[PDB]
Design a protein around this motif. Sequence first.
Motif, PDB file in Angstrom:
ATOM      1  N   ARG A   1     -18.793   0.627 -57.241  1.00 50.90           N
ATOM      2  CA  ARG A   1     -19.665  -0.541 -57.293  1.00 50.90           C
ATOM      3  C   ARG A   1     -20.463  -0.584 -58.588  1.00 50.90           C
ATOM      4  NH1 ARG A   1     -24.897   2.249 -57.312  1.00 50.90           N
ATOM      5  NH2 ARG A   1     -24.981   3.586 -55.450  1.00 50.90           N
TER       6      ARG A   1
ATOM      7  N   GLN B   1     -18.689   5.181 -56.024  1.00 45.43           N
ATOM      8  CA  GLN B   1     -18.531   4.233 -54.929  1.00 45.43           C
ATOM      9  C   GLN B   1     -17.908   2.928 -55.403  1.00 45.43           C
ATOM     10  OE1 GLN B   1     -22.561   5.757 -52.525  1.00 45.43           O
ATOM     11  NE2 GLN B   1     -22.131   3.575 -52.809  1.00 45.43           N
TER      12      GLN B   1
ATOM     13  N   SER C   1     -27.807  11.677 -51.999  1.00 46.16           N
ATOM     14  CA  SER C   1     -29.013  12.485 -51.865  1.00 46.16           C
ATOM     15  C   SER C   1     -29.901  12.005 -50.717  1.00 46.16           C
ATOM     16  CB  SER C   1     -29.790  12.472 -53.177  1.00 46.16           C
ATOM     17  OG  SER C   1     -29.822  11.164 -53.715  1.00 46.16           O
TER      18      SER C   1
ATOM     19  N   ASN D   1     -32.811   0.405 -52.052  1.00 47.72           N
ATOM     20  CA  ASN D   1     -33.466  -0.862 -52.336  1.00 47.72           C
ATOM     21  C   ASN D   1     -32.457  -1.992 -52.323  1.00 47.72           C
ATOM     22  OD1 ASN D   1     -35.470   1.077 -52.952  1.00 47.72           O
ATOM     23  ND2 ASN D   1     -36.480  -0.377 -54.335  1.00 47.72           N
TER      24      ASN D   1
ATOM     25  N   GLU E   1     -34.903  17.965 -50.792  1.00 46.10           N
ATOM     26  CA  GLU E   1     -33.690  17.168 -50.900  1.00 46.10           C
ATOM     27  C   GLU E   1     -32.440  17.911 -50.447  1.00 46.10           C
ATOM     28  OE1 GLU E   1     -32.910  15.924 -54.862  1.00 46.10           O
ATOM     29  OE2 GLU E   1     -31.053  14.863 -54.367  1.00 46.10           O
TER      30      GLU E   1
ATOM     31  N   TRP F   1     -41.228   6.130 -52.624  1.00 45.46           N
ATOM     32  CA  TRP F   1     -40.214   5.265 -53.227  1.00 45.46           C
ATOM     33  C   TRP F   1     -40.229   3.847 -52.682  1.00 45.46           C
ATOM     34  CZ3 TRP F   1     -36.567   9.842 -52.289  1.00 45.46           C
ATOM     35  CH2 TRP F   1     -36.701  10.746 -53.349  1.00 45.46           C
TER      36      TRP F   1
ATOM     37  N   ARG G   1     -32.564   8.663 -45.809  1.00 44.42           N
ATOM     38  CA  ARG G   1     -32.113   8.159 -47.091  1.00 44.42           C
ATOM     39  C   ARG G   1     -32.594   6.728 -47.299  1.00 44.42           C
ATOM     40  NH1 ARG G   1     -28.988   8.265 -51.227  1.00 44.42           N
ATOM     41  NH2 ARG G   1     -27.675   6.488 -51.844  1.00 44.42           N
ATOM     42  N   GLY G   2     -33.162   6.464 -48.472  1.00 43.21           N
ATOM     43  CA  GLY G   2     -33.708   5.155 -48.770  1.00 43.21           C
ATOM     44  C   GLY G   2     -32.924   4.418 -49.836  1.00 43.21           C
TER      45      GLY G   2
ATOM     46  N   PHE H   1     -27.120  10.070 -62.791  1.00 40.12           N
ATOM     47  CA  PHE H   1     -26.762   9.869 -61.386  1.00 40.12           C
ATOM     48  C   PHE H   1     -26.548   8.395 -61.057  1.00 40.12           C
ATOM     49  CE2 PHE H   1     -31.432   9.383 -60.828  1.00 40.12           C
ATOM     50  CZ  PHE H   1     -31.433   8.173 -60.165  1.00 40.12           C
TER      51      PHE H   1
ATOM     52  N   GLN I   1     -30.260  15.498 -60.043  1.00 42.08           N
ATOM     53  CA  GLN I   1     -31.465  14.901 -59.562  1.00 42.08           C
ATOM     54  C   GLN I   1     -32.315  14.675 -60.742  1.00 42.08           C
ATOM     55  OE1 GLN I   1     -34.056  17.378 -57.281  1.00 42.08           O
ATOM     56  NE2 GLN I   1     -33.307  19.249 -58.189  1.00 42.08           N
ATOM     57  N   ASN I   2     -32.830  13.479 -60.860  1.00 42.36           N
ATOM     58  CA  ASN I   2     -33.512  13.040 -62.060  1.00 42.36           C
ATOM     59  C   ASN I   2     -32.588  12.431 -63.039  1.00 42.36           C
ATOM     60  OD1 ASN I   2     -32.970  14.656 -64.489  1.00 42.36           O
ATOM     61  ND2 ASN I   2     -34.606  16.071 -63.984  1.00 42.36           N
TER      62      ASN I   2
ATOM     63  N   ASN J   1     -22.991   7.831 -59.399  1.00 44.43           N
ATOM     64  CA  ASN J   1     -22.932   7.281 -58.049  1.00 44.43           C
ATOM     65  C   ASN J   1     -22.356   5.868 -58.036  1.00 44.43           C
ATOM     66  OD1 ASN J   1     -24.130   9.672 -57.366  1.00 44.43           O
ATOM     67  ND2 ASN J   1     -26.050   8.791 -56.616  1.00 44.43           N
TER      68      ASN J   1
ATOM     69  N   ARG K   1     -40.483  17.681 -58.541  1.00 42.10           N
ATOM     70  CA  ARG K   1     -39.054  17.914 -58.725  1.00 42.10           C
ATOM     71  C   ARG K   1     -38.813  19.110 -59.643  1.00 42.10           C
ATOM     72  NH1 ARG K   1     -35.458  13.791 -58.876  1.00 42.10           N
ATOM     73  NH2 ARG K   1     -37.193  12.397 -59.438  1.00 42.10           N
TER      74      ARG K   1
ATOM     75  N   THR L   1     -33.453  13.308 -47.906  1.00 43.93           N
ATOM     76  CA  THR L   1     -34.580  14.207 -47.658  1.00 43.93           C
ATOM     77  C   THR L   1     -34.683  14.598 -46.193  1.00 43.93           C
ATOM     78  OG1 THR L   1     -35.997  12.237 -47.591  1.00 43.93           O
ATOM     79  CG2 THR L   1     -36.046  13.564 -49.584  1.00 43.93           C
TER      80      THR L   1
HETATM   81  N1  LIG Z   1     -32.261   8.040 -52.099  1.00 45.13           N
HETATM   82  C1  LIG Z   1     -33.055   8.811 -51.423  1.00 45.13           C
HETATM   83  O1  LIG Z   1     -33.449   8.530 -50.353  1.00 45.13           O
HETATM   84  C2  LIG Z   1     -33.470  10.061 -52.000  1.00 45.13           C
HETATM   85  C3  LIG Z   1     -33.397  10.228 -53.333  1.00 45.13           C
HETATM   86  N2  LIG Z   1     -33.756  11.344 -53.915  1.00 45.13           N
HETATM   87  C4  LIG Z   1     -33.683  11.478 -55.354  1.00 45.13           C
HETATM   88  O2  LIG Z   1     -33.816  10.224 -55.995  1.00 45.13           O
HETATM   89  C5  LIG Z   1     -32.817  10.005 -56.948  1.00 45.13           C
HETATM   90  C6  LIG Z   1     -31.865   8.839 -56.662  1.00 45.13           C
HETATM   91  O3  LIG Z   1     -31.210   8.748 -55.422  1.00 45.13           O
HETATM   92  P1  LIG Z   1     -30.584   7.340 -55.148  1.00 45.13           P
HETATM   93  O4  LIG Z   1     -31.751   6.473 -55.148  1.00 45.13           O
HETATM   94  O5  LIG Z   1     -29.727   7.344 -53.967  1.00 45.13           O
HETATM   95  O6  LIG Z   1     -29.699   7.060 -56.386  1.00 45.13           O
HETATM   96  P2  LIG Z   1     -28.272   6.492 -56.174  1.00 45.13           P
HETATM   97  O7  LIG Z   1     -27.790   5.589 -57.203  1.00 45.13           O
HETATM   98  O8  LIG Z   1     -27.487   7.510 -55.479  1.00 45.13           O
HETATM   99  O9  LIG Z   1     -28.521   5.369 -55.189  1.00 45.13           O
HETATM  100  C7  LIG Z   1     -29.642   4.564 -55.345  1.00 45.13           C
HETATM  101  C8  LIG Z   1     -29.447   3.052 -55.394  1.00 45.13           C
HETATM  102  O10 LIG Z   1     -28.156   2.534 -55.301  1.00 45.13           O
HETATM  103  C9  LIG Z   1     -28.326   1.173 -54.994  1.00 45.13           C
HETATM  104  N3  LIG Z   1     -27.136   0.576 -54.364  1.00 45.13           N
HETATM  105  C10 LIG Z   1     -26.605  -0.617 -54.616  1.00 45.13           C
HETATM  106  N4  LIG Z   1     -25.525  -0.848 -53.866  1.00 45.13           N
HETATM  107  C11 LIG Z   1     -25.365   0.205 -53.121  1.00 45.13           C
HETATM  108  C12 LIG Z   1     -24.418   0.593 -52.125  1.00 45.13           C
HETATM  109  N5  LIG Z   1     -23.426  -0.200 -51.774  1.00 45.13           N
HETATM  110  N6  LIG Z   1     -24.588   1.774 -51.588  1.00 45.13           N
HETATM  111  C13 LIG Z   1     -25.599   2.576 -51.923  1.00 45.13           C
HETATM  112  N7  LIG Z   1     -26.495   2.276 -52.832  1.00 45.13           N
HETATM  113  C14 LIG Z   1     -26.415   1.127 -53.452  1.00 45.13           C
HETATM  114  C15 LIG Z   1     -29.455   1.156 -54.034  1.00 45.13           C
HETATM  115  O11 LIG Z   1     -30.408   0.173 -54.340  1.00 45.13           O
HETATM  116  C16 LIG Z   1     -30.144   2.427 -54.253  1.00 45.13           C
HETATM  117  O12 LIG Z   1     -31.449   2.169 -54.641  1.00 45.13           O
HETATM  118  C17 LIG Z   1     -32.188  11.337 -57.054  1.00 45.13           C
HETATM  119  O13 LIG Z   1     -32.992  12.066 -57.936  1.00 45.13           O
HETATM  120  C18 LIG Z   1     -32.375  12.038 -55.773  1.00 45.13           C
HETATM  121  O14 LIG Z   1     -32.438  13.441 -56.003  1.00 45.13           O
HETATM  122  C19 LIG Z   1     -34.195  12.329 -53.184  1.00 45.13           C
HETATM  123  C20 LIG Z   1     -34.287  12.209 -51.824  1.00 45.13           C
HETATM  124  C21 LIG Z   1     -33.918  11.048 -51.220  1.00 45.13           C
END
Ligand SMILES: NC(=O)C1=CN([C@@H]2O[C@H](COP(=O)(O)OP(=O)(O)OC[C@H]3O[C@@H](n4cnc5c(N)ncnc54)[C@H](O)[C@@H]3O)[C@@H](O)[C@H]2O)C=CC1
Lengths: 77, 76, 71, 959
Positions: D496, D494, D587, D536, D629, D599, D533-534, D486, D480-481, D490, B72, D589
Motif C-alpha cells: 500500500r 503491505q 508493532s 490513524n 513494544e 499517539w 495497536r493504533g 519503517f 522502531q523510530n 511497512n 524509546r 504495545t
Molecule cells: N502502531 C502502534 O500502535 C505502535 C507503534 N509503536 C511504534 O511507533 C512506530 C510506528 O508504528 P506504526 O504507526 O504502525 O507505523 P506503520 O507504518 O507500521 O503503521 C502506521 C500507519 O500506517 C497507516 N496505514 C495506512 N493504511 C494502512 C493499512 N491498510 N494498514 C495499516 N496501516 C495503514 C496508518 O495510519 C498507521 O498510522 C514504531 O516506532 C513503533 O515501534 C509502538 C507501539 C505501538
Amino acid sequence: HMQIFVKTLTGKTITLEVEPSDTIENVKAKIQDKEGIPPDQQRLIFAGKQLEDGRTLSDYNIQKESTLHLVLRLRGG
Amino acid sequence: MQIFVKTLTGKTITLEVEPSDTIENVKAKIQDKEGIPPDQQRLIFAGKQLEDGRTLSDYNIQKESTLHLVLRLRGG
Amino acid sequence: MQIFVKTLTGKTITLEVEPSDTIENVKAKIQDKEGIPPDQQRLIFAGKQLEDGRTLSDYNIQKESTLHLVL
Amino acid sequence: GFSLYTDDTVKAAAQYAYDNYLGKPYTGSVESAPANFGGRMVYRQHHGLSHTLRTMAYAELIVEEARKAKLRGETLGKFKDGRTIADVTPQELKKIMIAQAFFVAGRDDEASDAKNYQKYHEQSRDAFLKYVKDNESTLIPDVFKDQEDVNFYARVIEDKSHDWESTPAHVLINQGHMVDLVRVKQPPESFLQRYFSSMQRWIGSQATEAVFGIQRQFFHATYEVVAGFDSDNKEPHLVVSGLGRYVIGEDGQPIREAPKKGQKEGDLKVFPQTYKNERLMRVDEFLKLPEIQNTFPGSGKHLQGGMPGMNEMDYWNRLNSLNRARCENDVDFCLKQLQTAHDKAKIEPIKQAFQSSKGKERRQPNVDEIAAARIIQQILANPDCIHDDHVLINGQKLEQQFFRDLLAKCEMAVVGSLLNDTDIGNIDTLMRHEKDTEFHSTNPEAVPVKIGEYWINDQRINNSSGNITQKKHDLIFLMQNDAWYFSRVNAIAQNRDKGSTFKEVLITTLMTPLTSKALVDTSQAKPPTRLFRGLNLSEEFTKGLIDQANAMIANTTERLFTDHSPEAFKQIKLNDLSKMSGRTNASTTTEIKLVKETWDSNVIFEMLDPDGLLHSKQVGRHGEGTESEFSVYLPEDVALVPVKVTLDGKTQKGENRYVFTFVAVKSPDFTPRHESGYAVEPFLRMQAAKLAEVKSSIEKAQRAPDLETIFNLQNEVEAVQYSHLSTGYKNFLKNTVGPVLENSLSGLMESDTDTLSKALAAFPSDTQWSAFNFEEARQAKRQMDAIKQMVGNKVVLDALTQCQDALEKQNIAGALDALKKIPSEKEMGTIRRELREQIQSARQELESLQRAVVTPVVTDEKKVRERYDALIENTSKKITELETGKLPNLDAVKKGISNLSNLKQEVTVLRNEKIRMHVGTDKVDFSDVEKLEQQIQVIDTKLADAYLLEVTKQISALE
Ligand SMILES: NC(=O)C1=CN([C@@H]2O[C@H](COP(=O)(O)OP(=O)(O)OC[C@H]3O[C@@H](n4cnc5c(N)ncnc54)[C@H](O)[C@@H]3O)[C@@H](O)[C@H]2O)C=CC1
C-alpha cells in the motif's frame, strides 16, 4: 620404406623403419641395433598373436604406423 | 512561554520555554528537570512526532498545550 | 392534439396525433417515425405505464403534453 | 462501554440485594430449609444470588443476540410502538438489571400459590423502591430520569396485571426469570420447546438458539445442572400451558375437536385425567408431530446432558462443591464466572466455523521460501549484483515485482529462520555497498535519508565491539523510530505504498526476514495475552471497518441444535480484517496508554492471544516509561477475528475513538492459495547457469577421447600372457582388467550408457594394483588411469547435461538423480576444484527437496465438504428467492440490486472453496457455481432493465 612401432611392458616405444616382406627374425635384429636386445630373447606379439620368425610382416598384415608388443623370453630361444 | 510534556508513567511536567528554540533544546529542558537523556526520549504532539532541529513555530506549538514524552531506548 | 414523447437519453422528439388512440395502435405509431422497432415499449405518462386495450381518451391525455417512453 | 460484568453501580445494587434479602435465611415455612454444598451454607439455592445473577446475564445475552439478529436482515417482533428487543439501550438495560436484582428479594418461602405469589412480589417491589430511595442522589439524576421511571420498573416487579409482553423491559425481566428454570424441571423437552417458542417470537430463531446455548455455559460456570435433550425420551410429555397432558385412545390417535375451516384441529389438552383404552402421549410422539417438526429445531436432535469429559459420578461431585456455594454467596466471584463464560462463548463459535488447528507452531518452508532465502542470502553476501532497477545473479534478472511477490507470498518469519548470523553480518557489507535514499511514507515534504551511510555510521558509534547479538538489537532499533525507514518498509510490505524506488522495495524484501530473525533470537520474554495497536484513519474509512467487523460479529452465534457455522465462515471470509496486520512486522504495545494518550489513535486493534499463537517478540527494553513494544509477523494460517466493536470517547482531535477487539484463531482455512514457482523457478535457472560454466570449462580443459590408447592396453593384456610374469598378473589382466576395457570401449564408442557408469565402477582400485609388486604393472596403471579419466570425463559431462536438461523442465528431483551420477574422487579426481562449484549445486538441491507441503484440508474433509454443501444450498436458495422477486416499485428494485451485489460476492467464496478443497491434477469441477453465475447474469439485466423502467416512471410522476 614404412615405419612401425615396438613397445615394451617396461614402457619404452621403439621406432623402426622397414619395408614389407621383411621377416620377423629380420625385424628382431633391427631391434638389436636400436635397443641392444638379443633376437634370441624376443617374442613379438600383434593383435593377440605371436609372430614366428619365418613369416613376413605382409603375412600378418602389419602395415605402416602399426603398433607391436615386444616381450622378453628367457630360458628359451 | 509555558508548555507541558506528559509521560506514560502518569505524571505531568511543567516547562518554561520560548517559541523560539529547537527541539533538542526543549528535549534538554526535560533532561535537566527529570534527569533523562535526550537520546532516549521522543516528543509527540497531537499523535505526531516532533523532530529535533525544528522549532516549535514550525509545528505551530502554542502556550498551555500538552506534549507526550515516551522512552524509546535501544535493545541491548 | 399535439404530443411529445421523450426518453431519459436526452433527445426530445415531437409526434403528431390527435385523439382516440389505444396502445396497440400507438405501438405501431412510434414505429413509423424513426424506424425504431416497437417489440416491447412501455408507456410513460403521469408516472404510470399504459396497458393495451384502454384508449388515449382514457387517462385524459391532452395536447402539447410530454411523454417519457422507454423500452 | 456498559456491561453487567463491569458496572460497579449495577454490581453494588446486587451486593445490596444479597446482603439484605437474598443472603438472609428463609423465614418461610415451605422448603425454606438451608442447603449445604461442600461444607458451606446457602440459604436459598433455588432463588438465591446465582439465580437473580444469571437472569441479569440473560438480559445482557438476549439483548446482544437481539442486536446481532438485527445486524442480519432479520425482523424482530415489534411491540405496541415500533421498538424491538434490539432497540434496548445501554442505559435502559442498566435500569432493567438493577430492577432485576430485587425481583426475588421479597421471597420468604418457596411456596408457589397465588396468595404467596402476590405477597412476595409485593415485598420485592418495595425492596427495589427502598434501595433507589436510599441512593436517589446518585441514581435519580443520571441512572434514572425521574421517579416516574423508577415506578415503571417497580410496577413490573409487582406484576399486578399478568402481562409480560408489554415492553422490552417487561419481556426481558419475565423470560429471564422463567428460562432459569431449565436447570430443574423434569420434562426438559416439554419445557425447552415451550421456552424456545416464547423467545422466538420476540428475538428470532437463530438468536434464541444462541441464548439457550450460551445458557448451558452459564449453568456450568455457576455449577448448576445442565439438563440434556433426548429426542427419543419416552417419558410422558407435559403440556406447559398449565399442567395438562395429551391423550391417545383406542386407535393410536391423539384426541381432538374440529372447528370451522380447519380440517383436523388442535389437541384437547385433557387436563390430567384418568382413563380407560386411553394412553398419554410421549415426549417423542409430541416431538415427531407434524406441528412440532416444522417449527422446532430440536426435533430429531440430541443434546448430551451433564458435563462432557467426566462420568456422572464425578459430575455429581462438581455440583455438590464449594464453588457451587461460593457462587450462591460471593457476588464478585459469580460475576467473573459468568463474565468469562460469556466472553468464551464469543470465541468458540469462531473456532467451530473453520476446520481445526493442531499446534501453535509456525509452519515449515515450502520450495519457494527455501529458494527465496537463498537469493536473499547471496544478495547480502554479494551486494555487487545490485543495480539501478534490478538484481543480477548467475545470469538471471530479478526485477521489482519479484521482490514484491516475495513479500506477498512468502512467510517472511519462516524465511527469516533459514538465515543466520553470517547473514546478519552482511548487513554491514550490504550497507557499505549502498549509499541510496529511503523516503517517508507520505510526508512528501520530508528529509530523505541515505540508508547505507546511516547504517554504517550507526554501528561505528553504537556497536563499538561489532557484537553480532547487538547488531540484531540495532536492526530492531532501526525498525522502531526513524520513520524514514519503517514508514517505507511497512508501506511496501503491505503493498500500500506509493512512488517507491527499486532500492526501497529490494531492501524491504531483505530487511523484513532479517528483522524477524533478529526478533526471534532476541526476545526471551513470555508472549503477552493482550496487545494493542493504533492507526490513524479517516472517520469514513473507519466506518467501513466497523461494518465489516459488525458482519462477522453478527453472523457468528453459539450453537444449540442447528449449525449456523457455514454462514459465519462465509461472512468472515468476506469481511476479514486480518490482512491489515500481516505481511510485515507490525508493532504493538502491552499498555493501552501508548495508543490512547501518546499517539492519539482513533482506531485501536485489541488483539487477544490466549492460545499463545501469533508469536510476538519483544522490542527494545521494557520499563516504567518505555513503549513496552512487541513485534508481530502474523502467521499465514492465523486470523484476527473480531469479537467486539466498542466506542471509547474521543481523541485530542475531537473524533470518536473505536476499539476493535480481535481474537487469534489458527486454521488451515486461512492459509492463502499461492501458485508455487515464483521464487524457485528463477533459482533453478540460476543453478543451471552455474553448471553451464563448470560444464563448459571441463569440456575444453581436459579433453578429447583418444580411442587408440584403449586398443593398446587391450593388446598389451593379451601380450602379457607370454611375459613370464606372475600367474595372477596374467589372470588379472585377462579376467579382471580385460572386461573393464571391454565395456569401456562399448560405452565410449556407442552413445552414452549406464555401461560407462557401471564400467567406471569396475575399475580396479590403486590398492589392487599395488598388490602386484613393482614392475611393468606401473606402466599398465598409468595406461589404465589415462583410460579412467577418459570414461570419467564422459560420464561427468553427460550427467551435467542430463541434469541441466532436468532444470530446464524443472524436475528438481530428476536433476539431483543425475548429479548422483558424477563420480567422486578416486574414480574421478582429474577435474580441478570446480568440484566445489558442483558439490555446491547438489547441496542447493538437497535443501530444495527438504520442502514441506503443508495441507489445507487438514482433516475434516467432512467439515470442509459438509460446510460447502450448506453454503451452495444457501446461496442457491438466495438466488432462486431473488429469481422470482416481485418488483412493484423502485424500492424493491434498489433492494434487489444490492442483493445481487452481495450474491456476486458469495459465489466467488463458493468458487475458492471449490478450488481449495480440490485434489489431484485435472480440471477443477465448477459445474455447480456455473449454473449459479448464469442465474446471476440473468437477474442482473432483469433488475437493470426494471430499474430504468422505475426511474422513468418516477420522473414522469414528478411532472
Ligand atoms: N502502531 C502502534 O500502535 C505502535 C507503534 N509503536 C511504534 O511507533 C512506530 C510506528 O508504528 P506504526 O504507526 O504502525 O507505523 P506503520 O507504518 O507500521 O503503521 C502506521 C500507519 O500506517 C497507516 N496505514 C495506512 N493504511 C494502512 C493499512 N491498510 N494498514 C495499516 N496501516 C495503514 C496508518 O495510519 C498507521 O498510522 C514504531 O516506532 C513503533 O515501534 C509502538 C507501539 C505501538
